[PDB]
């Protein structure tokens, strides 16, 4: 299967309450492995996975210092962006960055991405060709012209295609026990009488990894979007994920309904039915 390394950054300005809060998290696939919180006492990049603890002090010095530079850039970006949009300094605002690289099933570079947002709306993003940019409005077009001059996409591309995928490969290898795994969903079905003329069938998918999964209900072979509830795939807290799909069916017709579960850990999709 494919693999990804993604860094997520958030900076929230706090007018009148000090410097911006800065939170950085690093992910390999659906597994977080580093954190940094500008409010935390350590002022260091901290491990979030056991395999990243193998890295010696040189790694943690380098990552701490670079995540320090990330916060300092965002702290300036907040002041710059407030001026771009003619906003007052008393209002709180957010900048969010996400960059990283994908590899294919052959661990060769597949995709690179660098996305930037302001107040939750898309600001600027590096295109798939890793050489040009997409701007969302006139302010982001100003940023695009600045980064086109400083040859920022040239630096990002060299990092994404090379250093990024090399650290992703190394992470996959050191954390092979947990990163190169697929936990198939442990499934079951529940039944609840909503009325004397109705009943809710809930199809469960528990303790699966990765988070990508597909839950669909069918009535006599036909997919059933109406009267069906899907919840967001939620984390169990132990590194696995959960999801359920419910449908309110006419009582006595529960055998007409089937749940279908698709996951990377299933060699064939599962079919569940009230038994």
């Amino acid at each position: 299967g494919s693999h990804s390394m993604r860094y997520f950054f958030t900076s929230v300005s706090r007018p009148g309450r000090g410097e911006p809060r800065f939170i950085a998290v690093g992910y390999v696939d659906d597994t977080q492995f580093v954190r940094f919180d500008s409010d935390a006492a350590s002022q260091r990049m901290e491990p979030r996975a056991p395999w990243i603890e193998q890295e010696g002090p040189e790694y943690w010095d380098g990552e701490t210092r670079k995540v320090k530079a990330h916060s300092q850039t965002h702290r300036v970006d907040l002041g710059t962006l407030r001026g771009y949009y003619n906003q007052s300094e008393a209002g709180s605002h957010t900048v969010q960055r996400m960059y990283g690289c994908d590899v294919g099933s052959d661990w060769r570079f597949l995709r690179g991405y660098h996305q930037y947002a302001y107040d939750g709306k898309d600001y600027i993003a590096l295109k798939e060709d890793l050489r040009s940019w997409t701007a969302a409005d006139m302010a982001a077009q100003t940023t695009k012209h600045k980064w086109e001059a400083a040859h920022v996409a040239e630096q990002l591309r060299a990092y994404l295609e090379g250093t990024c995928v090399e650290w992703l490969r190394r992470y996959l290898e050191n954390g092979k026990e947990t990163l190169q795994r697929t936990d198939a969903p442990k499934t079951h079905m529940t039944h609840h009488a909503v009325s004397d003329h109705e009943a809710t069938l809930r199809c469960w998918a528990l303790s699966f990894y990765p988070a990508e999964i597909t839950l669909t209900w069918q009535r006599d072979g036909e997919d059933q979007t109406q009267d069906t509830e899907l919840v967001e795939t939620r984390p169990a807290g132990d590194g696995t994920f959960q999801k359920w799909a419910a449908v309110v069916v006419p009582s006595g017709q529960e055998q007409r309904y089937t749940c279908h579960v698709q996951h990377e850990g299933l060699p064939k999709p599962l079919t569940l039915r009230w038994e």
Binding site: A150, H151, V152, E154, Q155, A158, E161, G162, T163, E166
Partner: peptide
Amino acid sequence: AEKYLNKAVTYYYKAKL
């Protein structure tokens, strides 16, 4: 100074690639 640090980082990554 950013102009040249950006390019120095650029060629550092090109060296690693």
